[PDB]
Amino acid sequence: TLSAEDKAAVERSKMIDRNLREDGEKAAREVKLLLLGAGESGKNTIVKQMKITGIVETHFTFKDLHFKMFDVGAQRSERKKWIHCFEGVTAIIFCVALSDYDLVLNRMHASMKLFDSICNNKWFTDTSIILFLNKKDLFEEKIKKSPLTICYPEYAGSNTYEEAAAYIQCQFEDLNKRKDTKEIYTHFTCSTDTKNVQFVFDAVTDVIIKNNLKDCGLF
Amino acid sequence: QLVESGGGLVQPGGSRKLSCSASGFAFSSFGMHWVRQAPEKGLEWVAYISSGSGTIYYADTVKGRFTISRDDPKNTLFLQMTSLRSEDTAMYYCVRSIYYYGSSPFDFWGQGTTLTVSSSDIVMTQATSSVPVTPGESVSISCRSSKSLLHSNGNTYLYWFLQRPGQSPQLLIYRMSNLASGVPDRFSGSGSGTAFTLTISRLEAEDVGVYYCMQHLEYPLTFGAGTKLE
Amino acid sequence: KVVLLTFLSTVILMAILGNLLVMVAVCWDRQLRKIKTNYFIVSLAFADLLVSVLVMPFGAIELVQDIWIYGEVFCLVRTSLDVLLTTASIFHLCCISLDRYYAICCQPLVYRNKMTPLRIALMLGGCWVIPTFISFLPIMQGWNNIGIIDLIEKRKFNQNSNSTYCVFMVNKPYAITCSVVAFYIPFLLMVLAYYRIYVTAKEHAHQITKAAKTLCIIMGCFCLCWAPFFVTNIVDPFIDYTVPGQVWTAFLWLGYINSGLNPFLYAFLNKSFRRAFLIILCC
Amino acid sequence: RKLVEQLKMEANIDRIKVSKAAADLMAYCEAHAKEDPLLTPVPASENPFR
Amino acid sequence: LRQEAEQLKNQIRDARKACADATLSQITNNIDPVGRIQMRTRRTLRGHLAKIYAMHWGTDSRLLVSASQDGKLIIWDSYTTNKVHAIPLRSSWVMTCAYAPSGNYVACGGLDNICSIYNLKTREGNVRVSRELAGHTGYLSCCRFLDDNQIVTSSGDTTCALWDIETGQQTTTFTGHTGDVMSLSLAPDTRLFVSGACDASAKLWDVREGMCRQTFTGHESDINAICFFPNGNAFATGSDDATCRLFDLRADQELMTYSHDNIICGITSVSFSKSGRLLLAGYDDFNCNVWDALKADRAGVLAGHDNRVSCLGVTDDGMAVATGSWDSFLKIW
Ligand SMILES: NCCc1c[nH]c2ccc(O)cc12
Distance CA(E217)–CA(C179), nearest Å, equals 78
Strand order, beta sheet including E140-145: E140-145, E150-155, E159-164, E169-175
Taking alpha carbons only, the member of E72, C124, E287, B88 closest to residue A16 is: E72
Element holding B117 (H helix, E strand): strand B113-117
Residue of E nearest to B108 (CA): E123
One DSSP character per residue, E218-241 reads --SS-EEEEEE-TTSSEEEEEETT
Which long-range contacts does B176-180 make (Cβ < 8 Å, 24+ apart)?
Answer: B176/B149, B178/B104, B180/B104, B180/B107
Distance CA(C57)–CA(A42), nearest Å, equals 71
What letters, b where the CB count within 10 A reaches 16 and e where it falls short, cover E12-44? beeebeebeeebbeebbeeeeebeebebeeebe
Phi first, then psi, for residue C78 (nearest 5°) are: -60, -45
Element holding B37 (H helix, E strand): strand B31-37
Inter-chain contact E212–D10, Cβ cutoff 8 Å? Answer: yes
Q: Are the C-beta atoms of residues E52 and E66 closer than 8 Å to each other?
A: yes
What residues are paired with E311 via a beta bridge? E324
**Final resolution, Å:** 3.2
Domain membership of residue A54 (yes or no) is yes
Residue of B nearest to E83 (CA): B100
Q: Which domain holds residue C27?
A: 1-283
Taking alpha carbons only, the member of A127, A17, A87 closest to residue E93 is: A87
Inter-chain contact B26–E84, Cβ cutoff 8 Å? Answer: no
**Shortest-distance atom of ligand 1 to CA C181:** 8
The CATH number of whichever domain residue A146 belongs to comes to: 3.40.50.300
Report the number of distinct structural domains present in chain A.
1
Distance CA(E324)–CA(E333), nearest Å, equals 11
Distances (CA, A) of A175 to A100, A166, E323: 19, 15, 40
Distance CA(E158)–CA(B191), nearest Å, equals 55
Distances (CA, A) of E41 to C129, E45, E47, E66, E322: 38, 11, 17, 18, 10
- C93: Cα within 13 Å, side-chain hemisphere: 32
Q: Directed axis angle between helix A107-119 and helix A161-174, to 10°?
A: 40
3-state SS assignment for residue A101: helix
Taking alpha carbons only, the member of E227, E205, E267 closest to residue E56 is: E227
D44 CB-near residues (< 8 Å, 6+ apart):
D50
Candidates C204, C214, C217, C264, partner chain A, best to mutate (most A CBs within 10 A): C204
E86 interfacial to chain A (CB closer than 8 Å): yes
What letters, b where the CB count within 10 A reaches 16 and e where it falls short, cover B127-154? eeeeeebeeeeebebebbbeeebbbeee
Taking alpha carbons only, the member of E28, E108, E32 closest to residue E68 is: E108
CA angle, residues A35, A41, A46, in degrees to nearest 5: 55
Distance CA(E261)–CA(A211), nearest Å, equals 38
Element holding E88 (H helix, E strand): strand E82-88
3-state SS assignment for residue E65: strand
Cβ count within 10 A of residue B119: 9
Residue C233 in marked binding region: yes
Residue C82 in marked binding region: yes
Taking alpha carbons only, the member of E244, E330, E224 closest to residue E293 is: E244
Strand order, beta sheet including E267-272: E267-272, E278-283, E288-292, E298-302
E258 CB-near residues (< 8 Å, 6+ apart):
E243, E244, E245, E246, E279, E281, E291, E296
Distance CA(B227)–CA(B211), nearest Å, equals 5
Read off the amino acid at residue C186: P
Residue of E nearest to D32 (CA): E275
The burial class, CB within 10 Å (0-12 / 13-18 / 19+), for A180 is exposed
Taking alpha carbons only, the member of E57, E123, E134, E55 closest to residue E91 is: E134
Distance CA(B219)–CA(B122), nearest Å, equals 9
C274 CB-near residues (< 8 Å, 6+ apart):
C268
Distance CA(E187)–CA(E177), nearest Å, equals 19
Q: In this complex, which of B25, B100, B101 lies closest to E124 when CB atoms are compared?
A: B25
Taking alpha carbons only, the member of B129, B107, B133, B111 closest to residue B205 is: B133
Report the number of distinct structural domains present in chain E.
1
CA angle, residues E181, E183, E185, in degrees to nearest 5: 125
Distance CA(E25)–CA(D26), nearest Å, equals 11
Domain membership of residue A1 (yes or no) is no
Distance CA(A65)–CA(A58), nearest Å, equals 14
CA angle, residues A54, A59, A63, in degrees to nearest 5: 155
CA angle, residues E37, E40, E45, in degrees to nearest 5: 140
Q: Where are the beta strands (DSSP E) in E176-219?
A: 181-186, 192-197, 201-206, 212-217
Cβ count within 10 A of residue C86: 24
List chain A residues with CB under 8 Å of C269: 217
Distance (angstroms) between ligand 1 centre and the Cα of E120 equals: 66
Cβ count within 10 A of residue E265: 14
Q: Which domain holds residue A177?
A: 30-211
C185 CB-near residues (< 8 Å, 6+ apart):
none
One DSSP character per residue, C128-157 reads HHHHHHHHTHHHHTTTTTTT-HHHHHHHHT
Distance (angstroms) between ligand 1 centre and the Cα of C250 equals: 14
Q: What is the DSSP letter of E32?
A: P
For β-strands B227-229 and B130-131, DSSP reports them as parallel
- C32: Cα within 13 Å, side-chain hemisphere: 24
For β-strands A128-134 and A184-188, DSSP reports them as parallel
The CATH number of whichever domain residue E160 belongs to comes to: 2.130.10.10
Taking alpha carbons only, the member of E62, E63, A5, E120 closest to residue B99 is: A5
Taking alpha carbons only, the member of C211, E79, E271, E327 closest to residue A216 is: C211
State yes or no: cis peptide before C57, omega within 30 of 0.
no
Q: Are the C-beta atoms of residues B106 and B161 closer than 8 Å to each other?
A: yes
The burial class, CB within 10 Å (0-12 / 13-18 / 19+), for A193 is exposed
What residues are paired with E154 via a beta bridge? E142, E160
Element holding E312 (H helix, E strand): strand E309-314
Domain membership of residue A110 (yes or no) is yes
Distance CA(C275)–CA(C279), nearest Å, equals 6
CA angle, residues C272, C277, C281, in degrees to nearest 5: 155
For β-strands B8-10 and B15-22, DSSP reports them as unpaired
C192 CB-near residues (< 8 Å, 6+ apart):
none
Taking alpha carbons only, the member of B42, B44, B32, B4 closest to residue B20 is: B4
Chains that contact D by 3+ CB pairs under 8 Å?
E
Distance CA(E283)–CA(A137), nearest Å, equals 51
D6 interfacial to chain E (CB closer than 8 Å): yes
Q: Which domain holds residue E54?
A: 3-332
Q: How long a stretch of residues is chain C?
A: 283
E315 CB-near residues (< 8 Å, 6+ apart):
E57, E61, E321, E322
What residues are paired with E170 via a beta bridge? E163
Distance CA(B192)–CA(B173), nearest Å, equals 15
Read off the amino acid at residue A88: G
3-state SS assignment for residue B173: strand
Which long-range contacts does E160-165 make (Cβ < 8 Å, 24+ apart)?
Answer: E160/E184, E160/E195, E160/E205, E161/E135, E161/E136, E162/E207, E163/E115, E163/E133, E165/E117, E165/E130, E165/E131, E165/E133
Q: Are the C-beta atoms of residues A34 and A93 closer than 8 Å to each other?
A: yes
A10 CB-near residues (< 8 Å, 6+ apart):
A2, E80, E82
H helices of B82-228, where?
Answer: none
Distance CA(C134)–CA(C140), nearest Å, equals 10
D45 interfacial to chain E (CB closer than 8 Å): no
Distance of CA B136 to the CA centre of its chain: 28
The burial class, CB within 10 Å (0-12 / 13-18 / 19+), for D50 is exposed
3-state SS assignment for residue B47: strand
Q: In this complex, which of B25, B30, B100 lies closest to E84 when CB atoms are compared?
A: B100
List chain C residues with CB under 8 Å of A202: 207
A9 interfacial to chain B (CB closer than 8 Å): yes
H helices of chain A, where?
Answer: 4-28, 43-50, 107-119, 136-143, 161-174, 195-216
Read off the amino acid at residue C25: A
**Domains (ranges, CATH) in chain B?**
2-117 (2.60.40.10), 124-229 (2.60.40.10)
List chain A residues with CB under 8 Å of C37: 215-216
What residues are paired with E86 via a beta bridge? E74
Taking alpha carbons only, the member of C181, C277, C182 closest to residue C222 is: C182
Q: How long a stretch of residues is chain D?
A: 50
Distances (CA, A) of C16 to C40, C51, C80, C100, C249: 18, 9, 21, 26, 21
One DSSP character per residue, C171-208 reads -HHHHHHHHIIIIIHHHHHHHHHHHHHHHHHHHHT---
Element holding C254 (H helix, E strand): helix C245-263
